[PDB]
Every structure is written in C-alpha cells, then in structure tokens.
Design a protein around this ligand. Structure first.
Ligand code: SF4
Ligand code: SF4
Lengths: 225, 225
C-alpha cells in the first residue's frame, strides 16, 4: 500500500465513520486542542469530556487559566489522575501569558517549548486546530503504524521511535491533515485496540501486515526483559 | 426516596457526568430531536452519529426531507436497519410539510399524531428541544424505574406499562426537565445496563430496591412463557 493510498483510505473512512462533535472539535482553537490533548494523554475520552467542559467554562482563555491560583487548577483536575500534567498545564499557560501575550502560540518550536508538551502533542495542537502539516505519534498512532508496517521493536528504543516517526511522516498528508490525524487517533482508540483489534472494520486491513498474518500481538514490541 | 429527591439526585449527576455535546444536543430543535430519537430507537448511539450528521447535512429542515424522493431517504438510511422507521420518518416529514406549514409541531397531540411517533417519542421531542414538561418511557427509562421501584411485571402488559408511566410522571420535574429526561436515558444506556448494571456509579443507588437486594435481574419482568 503506497503512502498516498494509506492516507486516502484513512480520509475516506473518517468521512463516513468519523465524528467531529467532541467538544474540542467544535470551534477548534490551539488552546482547546492543547487542553484536550493533555487531558486525554493518560485518561479515557469518556472521563475527560466533563472535565474539559468544566475547564473551558471556568477558563475560557489561556490567560484565565494562567491567572488562576494553582490550587484551584489542581482542585478542578481532581479525579483525572497524573497531576504532573495539571502542574505542567498551569506552567504552560503562564508561559503563554508571559511570553506570548496570552495568545497561544501557533508555530511549532514555541508550542513544543511549553512544559508538558512534546513533539507529538505540539504537532497535534497545530495540525488539528490550524491544519498545519505536522505528523503525530501518540500511543494510538504507534499501534496502528507498528501493526500495519510490522514494527517489531519496542518504541521505547530510540531507533524504533525514529522508525515510527518516519512512517508517520510518510503517510501524513498536508491536504486534510486535520482529518487524517484525528482519524489515526480514532482508529488506534476504537478499532486498532491493544487487544483483539477489529480489523474487519479497519480501512487499512487490505494492506496491513499484522492483519495479513493475524500477528497484531507482535506489534508494537513490548518492553524487553 | 421521595420523588423530589429522585430528580434532584439525577439532575446533580447529569450536571457532573452528563455530556450534552452529541450533535442533536447542539442548537436543539424539535426536528433534530425527532430525527435522532427515531434513529436511536433501534440503533446504538455510536452507529447513529454519522447517519444523523449525513441526514442533517442533506436535509437541513423537515421540508427538505419531505420533498426528497423516498428512495433517496431509504438509500441514506442504508445500514441503520428497521426501515419501517425510515418510511414513517418520510411520511411524518410530509405530514409536517402538508399540515403544519413545514414547521415541526410544538404541541403534544400534533407531534404524537405523526407516523412513527408514540407517546414517549412525542414527550422526548418536546421536553428535550423546548423544555416542555413531559415524561418519557423508552427502554432505558423502563429499566431504571423498574429496578428502582421493583416493577416485576412485563412492560408488555398494559397495567405494568401504566405503572411505569405513573412512576415516570411522578419523578419527572418541570424545572430542568430537558436535563432530567436526557439524564434518565443516559443512565439507562450507560449505567443501568441490561446486564450487570454499574450501581456504584449510579446516583439512585441509595434508594434503588434492586440495588439493595442485588436483584436487578428481576426487573423489568421479561415476556412470560
Ligand atoms: S487492519 Fe487490524 S491490526 Fe491492521 S491497522 Fe487495522 S485494526 Fe490494526
Ligand atoms: S442502582 Fe443499579 S439497578 Fe438501581 S437504577 Fe442504578 S444502576 Fe440501575
């Protein structure tokens, strides 16, 4: 499957099966996408949705979040777990208020420099909210690409991570990047699941090596020892 | 648990756990709620969402739906199953165009007279879209009320159905009815499930007879024979 076929297939699927009615998909902005990405990274969507809504109501802009006392932020976070995310969230908001005039930055290096934001989260923020042409590589994406392309290694190894980023870059289009990147996360979350993926429901099933060999359990590699 | 406590508990739960970002909860109208109720009645939400979106895009108003050829309606329905719903949908749209000037009716008797719309669907349409004070009684609601109140009988029997409607009427508030009725369906769909309900996550657990006796399997009564 040529990379142009991969993204065409994924975009066609997203058109007919995607949903873009999550609250961080309505009236999308860099702030909303960042907030949602941080919440989602160690929490399931069903649980995040009411927290997202409460945070957007209490903190309509990144400057409101920055000016709030940290204890109020932690209190609103209560129940999401992994509170280093909340502490980095608040620091990042403060850095946006201080360094960027309260306007969430729209260029990659400035986004990636925020506390709590890595390369994938920065490309997610800018691709999903502004259609900028960046690939992503969260756990969902890693599982889809590692299965399709038979990446055996543990992504905790630098060369394996690098191989996965190269594959992501290869399949990520510029045209329709916001749809493609949302679709890849939705696929990884709902279809290409950690256990017993639903390959018959997958738009990649015709080219996926794991599907061909019923070998999804091999990919990605797990932590060796 | 007094009925005023029941609806207070449910409304408090909905406030903190509800989500009102489904596409038929945004910019709600009688048309949108009707369409979604018909689709949902024999189809799971995950499957309905892309169909709802396609129907709203193709048919922004009930008059567009009425003027479309039936074959196009059936073709767009393809995959939802239970196509008598689609045939009644189109007839109902035509009856709205013909009898009600293309304005989806906002009074109970006119709504309930539409093909495909019963007493519960009519109260759902008007309560959810306009805050009118009508109770509902779909399968989700029946399961929550029958468990809470130990209604042993099969709701296919008229007296049992009547008992369930009386209970629904008793707990349904006027203030906050749109939230209460959405919350009761969400509870029945996600928490008070047909199998192994999640009672520890349920706002009624402190007064529910089924929870008290771990006897949810008895309620509602199943079809005798
Ligand atoms: S075909 Fe199966 S293993 Fe391959 S990407 Fe799709 S869901 Fe995953
Ligand atoms: S407590 Fe359990 S059985 Fe009772 S209404 Fe709630 S989920 Fe259903």
């Amino acid at each position: 499957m040529q990379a142009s076929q991969f993204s065409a297939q994924v975009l066609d699927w997203y058109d007919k099966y995607g949903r873009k009615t999550l609250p961080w998909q309505i009236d999308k902005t860099p702030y909303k996408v960042w907030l949602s990405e941080v919440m989602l990274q160690q929490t399931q969507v069903a649980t995040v949705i009411p927290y997202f809504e409460r945070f957007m109501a209490r903190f309509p802009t990144v400057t409101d979040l920055a000016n709030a006392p940290l204890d109020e932020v932690l209190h609103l976070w209560t129940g999401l777990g992994y509170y280093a995310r909340a502490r980095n969230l608040h620091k990042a908001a403060q850095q946006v208020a201080t360094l960027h005039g309260g306007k969430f930055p729209e260029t990659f290096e400035e986004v990636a420099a925020l506390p709590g934001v890595g390369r994938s989260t920065a490309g997610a923020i800018l691709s999903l909210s502004l259609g900028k042409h960046f690939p992503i590589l969260d756990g969902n994406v890693k599982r889809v690409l590692a299965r399709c392309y038979a990446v055996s290694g543990w992504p905790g190894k630098k060369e394996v991570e690098n191989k996965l980023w190269s594959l992501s870059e290869q399949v990520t289009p510029a045209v329709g990047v916001e749809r493609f990147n949302q679709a890849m996360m939705d696929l990884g979350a709902m279809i290409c699941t950690r256990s017993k993926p639903k390959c018959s429901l997958c738009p990649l099933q015709n080219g996926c090596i794991a599907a061909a060999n019923n070998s999804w359990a091999l990919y990605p590699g797990k932590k060796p020892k």
